[PDB]
């Protein structure tokens, strides 16, 4: 039992015990990259697959082949911390073993000579962090997993557009993993067409002609032969009694010598059964029935070889007479039924203009490339490379398995390139679907959509890099020497590394990690994107993909997605879902034996799920997996229904498996509207970390899992006893049974403190443990941002009352007590970044100095002698941080300026001020200063000081580690020395460093003493080499981009408090803006006198359907009542027994609760620890759909000595008169979103204009004005608003002359305008004239 749990036990409701612990929430990314990077002894995902696919590379003449052996990952030159500090990527060098082999020159193959290049460096690949992220430019980036149509065959239905004919059609698309798409589509004329990619359709038989198939061969492979024996008169035919279905009697149906069905009759099942039981062999048929038939193959004369019949023509009297007289006896016709295989292939062959492979190749080559005279070799090469080139066309394992699955083959593996048999099978399946025998497949079923995680995308991009470097290598093998030359000189690392960096850094699916919550990071790493390269563009809607499909159940969270124009495209992966081996989504299900529901699990994929019937997680089971309902609700084929308890095959593992972490963290989700729950889940990711991040009273139980699994929490890798606690360091003495052989020593955890996140929010870790605390693996040593006691603590729990209050909470607004700002809660810390670059201009190199010409001495005060502000100095907007100056160029002076300089005796300064000022509107303390001067450029004093600081920090860390290790070494040295003759009297009084100067007689003890002396020397060398290695990193400068001499980074920490205008919300989706912070007295207060911290508009509940917030408020009353009672007991300090009894009763209170009770804790210390942790309230865990009921909430409220109805009458603050009827009060978890009003102001009257236009916009310090778009112009035109419109258009927007004249007039105190002409219109005129078009302005 975790000691972290011992410190605070969250009361968990829920009547159905979970049998499957929550999976490691980041398993997707970690497993993806492990598959990408780990060695494979066989062809498997990752670098190995790409290398074995592209290697060996064969030379274009020369017999000089490059063969692959293996790859090795070099250890990164910089760790994560220094990578973030220095702004460089966290990457590992890639080194590959290769061999150049030269065969017999020139003769059949066989090696003559071979040379080996070992560990050749062909680029650096970003290495994955332990948090599941990558560091690329000092910013921690995340690669979102992509949901894309799986390689294979999709038999889609074409509907809604019918070529003005109706009769919706079918089309089969072969989507390769890499290569060209293939399409087999139908037309309303019942003809089949082939499209390579999306070019012009060709008749479908052309591909078969190119595949070297005769017309008779095609007809045999597709249609069924019908045997016609030339006997009696005008032939008889061999009739299968099963063949005649849905046909009319146009021919006498004879059997046993007599006709059973006469011509003109309707053939039913009775006649069919009679014929089958009578076993009709052959029947005589009239020639009229024959005249509509089609001959399958060719027929020549049997005595003179004259052609009289060929493949695929209709039959007629003359042809029948010719074939009868020629000497034939057997005629093979085509079976053509309008319900069975129809006249599709026959008519397609009729449309076919080609009859041979060569013409098919010509047609393919001309449709793929317009014109382009069809050279036979070129056409053959194009056709072969389109579908049969392993380096140009590939399906991969997933594609092959889907290909065989849709064609119903027991094979699940095979060659990536297509074969003729596969194409023919695809045609047969599509034709059967056209006949109605087959069924279409959704392109939205999760079985047809595969997830490319980080590893697969990286491997594909690395394969592209290998392809381009393969082109380079193949060019070089013939351009370069055809004999011995070292292969490292012919491999180019620039393209592969550059492309890999392009993928990881600048891509649609490589995003800055949304880093303001542990939940935000978890959601971003679990995000599933339908966009990106190879996915879906935003040109969609396209409702199908955006809509939630029934297969998403338990695989993708249905209620978490952005509300922008990408809704239903950016999903979040469910809590329990994991990627299948083939990349599909599989979810765990408890295997259900007919009678007993077993505890064993099976991860069912999407397609496998439909076969079985799956029971809902709400099913009530007593004892060992026995249902209490004979008919239980389940889902089998995507439709929910009641099934008897003896046919169920699987059950949901947990009630929370149908949502993601963000959705799962919302309490009483079962009581909320899906729209508003979606809004709440989306906003929960935007919570800003809070300085006092305590806990949510009403949790869901995923708080601990989310906090632990995210990287923001320092978790003890190996258990033991806490040896040292510090705000920056935590040192753990590992347990005896957990240390490696020899001296493994201590485990040190450096706590990340006050570091800029990607949202300019502070992320620091505070130690939540103390000295001597026993910790074990998986314990929370340090609580990260928005995390306390190992629980996820985004927002804060606050007392809220649902009532209108003088209209200040009017739309969705929140009213907030002054106690909130007084308690300094919801007060966030924003660490923003400022960069001042001293560059090298052609006017002269810029420099950083304290002395700035023509500036106030206050600016000089805050800087050192190096021109850099002191760390910890308080600065405001406009203050100078870095004393940059730029060599001033030539100066032009107006006559008045010349007169003034002549008068005052002053002259132009040779250097202009370019110092970095604080942008106006922000304040705060300079907490950190970074100085980056490139190697080869002289260092300044401040950089030397910073390097010395970090050097001594590393030195202190190393010295602490070394002194602990050497203290252990000296202790064991004394232990050895005391043995073999008592030498403990003098040794005990001697310094531990003088303990190796005592000799001993020749023995095992003496040899051990010598070995330990050698170990001491080795430890000294280890310390020296470690210090040297880290000093090399510290001392060396950062190789910056050319042009910048130095970079000065300054961190500003703004303690930004909550104020009116800030956006604040709840978990359930209730939103709003804080209207006014009233004084504490004005708050309505209860009878006891506690004023309510927050007042919410109650009218927002019954229309937003989110009653769950009311239940959360009531449960908050219950929790805080238990907390108040336990706090009163603690102040009264009754005894251990009373507090233990009360806590036990509180945990017991419920119904079929799986909480588990005490005593299993310590008698006194743990009881008081729990009491101190709960005095602020007992946290309650409400599972997502196994949550607490109203009866349980009311019982818990009764335990808290609180009104059962959850409503207390409140006395107004202004009038001191109680409101009529009670009002709902309670402790609700409220969130401060990252939409602070301080960031939302921008205002300008003068500033950034533009180059091409004069529209005012630009600047991250002062932005442009507000876009007065066409909507607002219409709004003004609607009124008689003319002069205001003209101001919007000319004076303040684009008329530079008018703008200056207006500014001068307003300063002078005059209000009138020059209409002028906006510069935008002059730009328009000049640009129209730039074409061959005249445009002018004409007077009357």
């Amino acid at each position: 039992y975790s000691y972290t749990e011992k410190k605070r036990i969250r009361k968990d409701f829920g009547k159905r015990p979970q049998v499957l612990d929550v999976p490691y929430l980041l398993s997707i990314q970690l497993d993806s990259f492990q598959k990408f990077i780990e060695q494979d002894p066989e062809g498997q995902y990752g670098l190995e697959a790409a290398f074995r696919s592209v290697f060996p590379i064969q030379s274009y003449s020369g017999n000089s082949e490059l063969q692959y052996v293996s790859y090795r990952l070099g250890e990164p030159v910089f760790d994560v911390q220094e990578c973030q500090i220095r702004g460089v990527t966290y990457s590992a060098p890639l080194r590959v073993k290769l061999r150049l082999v030269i065969y017999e020159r020139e003769a059949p193959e066989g090696t003559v000579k071979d040379i080996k290049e070992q560990e050749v460096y062909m680029g650096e690949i970003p290495l994955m962090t332990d948090n599941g992220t990558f560091v690329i430019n000092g910013t921690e980036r995340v690669i979102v997993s992509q949901l894309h149509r799986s390689p294979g065959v999709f038999f889609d239905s074409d509907k809604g557009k019918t070529h003005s004919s109706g009769k919706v059609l079918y089309n089969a698309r072969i989507i390769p993993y890499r290569g060209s798409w293939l399409d087999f589509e139908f037309d309303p004329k019942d003809n089949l067409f082939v499209r390579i990619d999306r070019r012009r359709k060709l008749p479908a038989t052309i591909i078969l002609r190119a595949l070297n198939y005769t017309t008779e061969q095609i007809l045999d492979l597709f249609f069924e032969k019908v045997i016609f024996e030339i006997r009696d008169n005008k032939l008889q035919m061999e009739l299968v009694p099963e063949r005649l279905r849905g046909e009319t009697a146009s021919f006498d149906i004879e059997a046993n010598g007599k006709v059973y069905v006469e011509k003109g009759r309707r053939i039913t099942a009775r006649h069919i059964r009679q014929l089958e039981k009578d076993d009709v062999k052959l029947i005589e048929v009239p020639v009229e029935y024959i005249a509509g038939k089609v001959v399958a193959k060719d027929y020549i004369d049997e005595s003179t070889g004259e052609l009289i019949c060929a493949a695929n023509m209709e039959l007629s009297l003359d042809l029948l007479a010719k074939l009868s007289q020629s000497g034939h006896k057997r005629i093979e016709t085509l079976f053509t039924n309008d319900l069975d295989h129809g006249p599709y292939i026959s008519e397609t062959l009729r449309v076919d203009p080609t009859n041979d492979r060569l013409s098919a190749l010509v047609e393919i080559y001309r449709m793929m490339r317009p014109g382009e005279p069809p050279t036979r070799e070129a056409a053959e090469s194009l056709f072969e490379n389109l579908f049969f080139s392993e380096d140009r066309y590939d399906l991969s394992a997933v594609g092959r398995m889907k290909f065989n699955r849709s064609l119903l083959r027991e094979e699940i593996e095979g060659s990536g390139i297509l074969s003729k048999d596969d194409i023919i099978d695809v045609m047969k399946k599509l034709i059967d679907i056209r006949n109605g025998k087959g069924e279409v497949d959704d392109i939205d079923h999760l079985g047809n959509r595969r997830i490319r995680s980080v590893g697969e995308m990286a491997e594909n991009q690395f394969r592209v890099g290998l392809v381009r470097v393969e082109r380079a290598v193949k060019e070089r093998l013939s351009l370069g020497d055809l004999d011995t030359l070292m292969p490292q000189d012919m491999i180019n690392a620039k393209p592969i590394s550059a492309a890999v960096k392009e993928f990881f850094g600048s891509s649609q699916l490589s995003q800055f990690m949304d880093q303001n919550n542990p939940l935000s990071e978890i959601t971003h790493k679990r995000r599933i994107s339908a966009l990106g390269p190879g996915g879906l563009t935003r040109e969609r809607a396209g409702f199908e993909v955006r809509d939630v499909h029934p297969t998403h159940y338990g695989r993708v969270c249905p209620i978490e997605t952005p509300e922008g124009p990408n809704i239903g495209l950016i999903n979040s992966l469910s809590v329990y879902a994991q990627t299948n081996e083939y990349g599909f989504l599989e979810t765990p299900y408890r295997k259900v034996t007919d009678g007993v529901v077993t505890d064993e699990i099976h991860y069912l994929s999407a397609i496998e799920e439909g076969n079985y019937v799956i029971a809902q997680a709400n099913s009530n089971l007593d004892e060992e997996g026995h249902f209490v309902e004979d008919l239980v609700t389940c889902r089998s084929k995507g439709e929910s229904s009641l099934f008897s308890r003896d046919q169920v095959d699987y059950m949901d593992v947990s009630t929370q498996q149908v949502v993601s972490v963000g959705a799962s963290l919302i309490p009483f989700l079962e009581h909320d509207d899906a729209n508003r729950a979606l809004m709440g889940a989306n906003m929960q990711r935007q919570a800003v970390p809070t300085l006092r991040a305590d806990k949510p009273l009403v949790g869901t139980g995923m708080e601990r899992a989310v906090a632990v699994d995210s990287g923001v929490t320092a978790v003890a890798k190996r258990g033991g006893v806490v040896q040292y606690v510090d705000a920056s360091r935590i040192v753990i003495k590992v347990n005896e049974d957990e240390m490696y052989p020899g001296e493994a020593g201590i485990d040190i955890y450096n706590l990340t403190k006050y570091t800029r996140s990607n949202q300019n929010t502070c992320i620091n870790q505070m130690p939540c443990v103390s000295l001597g605390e026993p910790v074990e693996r998986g314990d929370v040593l340090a609580d990260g941002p928005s995390t306390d006691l190992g629980e996820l603590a985004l927002g804060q729990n606050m007392r809220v009352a649902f009532m209108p209050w003088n209209g200040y909470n009017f739309e969705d607004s929140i009213l907030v007590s002054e106690r909130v700002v007084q308690e300094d809660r919801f007060t966030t810390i924003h660490i923003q970044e400022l960069a001042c670059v001293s560059r090298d201009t052609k006017l002269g190199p810029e420099e950083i100095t304290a002395d700035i010409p023509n500036v106030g001495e206050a600016a000089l005060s805050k800087l050192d002698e190096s021109g850099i502000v002191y760390i910890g100095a308080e600065v405001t907007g406009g203050d100078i941080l870095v004393g940059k100056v730029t060599p001033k160029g030539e100066t032009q002076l107006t006559p008045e300026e010349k007169l003034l300089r002549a008068i005052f005796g002053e002259k132009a300064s040779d250097v202009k001020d370019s110092s970095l000022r604080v942008p106006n509107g922000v304040s705060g303390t300079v907490i950190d200063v970074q100085v980056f001067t490139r190697d080869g450029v002289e260092k300044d004093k401040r950089a030397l000081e910073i390097e010395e600081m970090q050097l001594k920090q590393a030195k202190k860390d190393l010295s602490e580690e070394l002194q602990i290790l050497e203290a252990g070494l000296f202790s064991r040295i004394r232990a050895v020395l005391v043995a073999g003759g008592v030498e403990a009297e003098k040794l005990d009084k001697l310094p531990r460093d003088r303990w190796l100067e005592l000799g001993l007689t020749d023995e095992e003890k003496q040899n051990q003493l010598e070995q330990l002396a050698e170990q001491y020397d080795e430890l000294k060398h280890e310390f020296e080499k470690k210090l040297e290695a880290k000093r090399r990193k510290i001392t060396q400068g950062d190789d910056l981009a050319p042009g910048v001499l130095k970079i000065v980074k300054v961190y500003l920490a703004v303690k930004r408090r909550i104020q009116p205008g800030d956006k604040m919300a709840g978990r359930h989706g209730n939103k709003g803006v804080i209207s006014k912070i009233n004084p504490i007295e004005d708050m309505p207060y209860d009878e006891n006198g506690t004023p309510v911290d927050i007042v919410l508009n109650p009218l927002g509940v019954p229309s937003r359907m989110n009653i769950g917030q009311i239940l959360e408020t009531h449960l908050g009353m219950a929790a805080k009542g238990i907390g108040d009672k336990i706090n009163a007991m603690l102040k009264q300090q009754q005894e251990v027994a009373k507090l233990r009894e009360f806590i036990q009763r509180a945990y017991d209170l419920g119904a079929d609760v799986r909480q588990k009770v005490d005593l299993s804790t310590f008698s006194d210390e743990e009881v008081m620890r729990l009491a101190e942790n709960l005095r602020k309230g007992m946290p309650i865990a409400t599972p997502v759909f196994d949550g607490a009921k109203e009866a349980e909430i009311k019982e818990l409220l009764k335990l808290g000595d609180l009104p059962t109805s959850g409503q207390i009458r409140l006395y107004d603050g202004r009038t001191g008169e109680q409101f009529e009827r009670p009002v709902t009060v309670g402790y609700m978890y409220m969130l401060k979103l990252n939409h602070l009003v301080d960031d939302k102001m921008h205002a300008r009257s003068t500033g950034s204009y533009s180059l091409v236009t004069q529209q005012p916009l630009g600047g991250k310090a002062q932005f442009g004005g507000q876009r007065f778009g066409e909507m607002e112009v219409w709004a003004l035109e609607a009124y008689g608003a003319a002069y205001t419109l003209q101001e919007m258009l000319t004076v303040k927007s684009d008329d530079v002359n008018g703008r200056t004249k207006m500014y001068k007039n307003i300063v002078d105190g005059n209000h009138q305008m020059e209409p002028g002409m906006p510069e935008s219109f002059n730009v328009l005129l000049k640009e129209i004239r730039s074409l061959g078009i005249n445009i002018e302005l004409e007077d009357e």
Partner: protein, 58 residues
């Protein structure tokens, strides 16, 4: 072809001899990158050329 790449491919004009110097710098950078295996250090770039190093960065 080299003249065309020098003139009509660069948005800003770069002299042909300067283009050849750039190509030599890039080739030597690739050589040093694949030899050292880490990165092209400006010191070695200066050593290989007769060119000081500030001219190299410009």
């Amino acid at each position: 072809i080299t003249r065309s790449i020098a003139d009509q491919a660069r948005t800003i004009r770069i002299p042909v001899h300067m283009i050849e110097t750039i190509n030599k710098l890039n080739r030597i950078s690739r050589q040093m990158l694949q030899e050292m295996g880490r990165e092209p250090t400006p010191e070695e770039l200066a050593e290989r050329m007769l060119m000081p190093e500030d001219k190299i960065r410009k």
